[PDB]
Paper text:
Peptide deformylases (PDFs) are metalloproteases that catalyze the removal of the formyl group from the initiator methionine, a critical step in the N-terminal methionine excision (NME) process. All peptide-based PDF inhibitors share a common mechanism of action: they bind to the catalytic pocket of the enzyme, thereby preventing substrate access and inhibiting its deformylase activity. Furthermore, our investigation of [name], which encodes two type 1b PDFs with 50% sequence homology (Def1VCH and Def2VCH), demonstrated that both PDFs are catalytically active.
The canonical PDF, Def1VCH, is located on chromosome 1 within an operon that includes fmt, rsmB, trkA (as in E. coli), trkH, and a gene of unknown function with a conserved DUF3157 domain (VC0041). In Def1VCH, all amino acids crucial for ribosome binding are identical to E. coli PDF, while in Def2VCH, R153 is substituted by a methionine and R163 by a lysine. To explore this possibility at the molecular level, we determined high-resolution crystal structures of both proteins in complex with ACT. In both structures, ACT binds in the same location within the catalytic pocket and adopts a nearly identical orientation and conformation, blocking access to the active site located at the bottom of a deep cavity in the protein core. Additionally, in the hydrophobic pocket containing the ACT P1' aliphatic chain, isoleucine at position 86 and leucine at position 125 in Def1VCH are substituted by glycine and phenylalanine, respectively, in Def2VCH. Substitution of arginine 97 with tyrosine in Def1VCH resulted in a significant increase in the MIC to ACT, reaching levels comparable to those conferred by Def2VCH.
Author numbering: 0 to 167
């Protein structure tokens, strides 16, 4: 009942769009959620933000499980508390092939709506907390390369442009 969507890649200006809150959790929103899950699973990857598939609403899906059967849906997520410092080497479906250390909060408390519009909240640490922060950055138009030096980011940009230089 769902489809894999095209993932935008840096330097696509649409990745800089700031997502709007979801107004109501309609069947249309649930279809977006389902398509985002399908898209996330089509690849090695543990989360996806709607911005990355050119849908500029505050929708995130996550599955950090090894078995890929523990999905989490975050509509209108808000980080309401941050604690501590952590940082791991991150990659991004919208910056394929690039990896870098990103300083993050170690722990976050997040409030969101689930796929059915039910409000909930959770405290996250370790990989879940890092993933949440990475995905919420996407909704703000922010990519992990924005934490890097201009030189490192620009070299990544040029390499990704070369890969798509014959598209369209
Ligand atoms: C780690 C912080 C959030 C990661 C989310 C991304 C997917 C993404 O771009 N979401 O916007 C991912 O799965 N990245 C993967 C990644 O960096 N992973 C997957 C598990 C943890 C770490 C180790 O490679 C790679 C395979 C692209
Ligand atoms: Ni990403």
């Amino acid at each position: 009942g769902s489809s894999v969507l095209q993932v935008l890649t840096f330097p696509d200006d649409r990745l800089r769009t700031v997502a709007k809150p979801v107004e109501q959790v309609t069947p249309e929103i649930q279809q977006i959620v389902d398509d985002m899950l399908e898209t996330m699973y089509a690849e090695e990857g543990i989360g996806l933000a709607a911005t990355q598939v050119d849908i500029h609403q505050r929708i995130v899906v996550i599955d950090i499980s090894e078995t890929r059967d523990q999905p989490m849906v975050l509509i209108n997520p808000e980080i309401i508390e941050k604690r501590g410092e952590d940082g791991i080497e991150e990659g991004c479906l919208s910056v394929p092939g690039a990896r870098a250390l990103v300083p993050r909060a170690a722990e976050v408390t997040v409030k969101a709506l689930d796929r059915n519009g039910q409000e909930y909240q959770f405290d996250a640490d370790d990989l879940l907390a890092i993933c949440v922060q990475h995905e919420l950055d996407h909704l703000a138009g922010k990519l992990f390369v924005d934490y890097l030096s201009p030189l490192k980011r620009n070299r990544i940009k040029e390499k990704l442009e070369k890969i798509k230089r014959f598209n369209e």
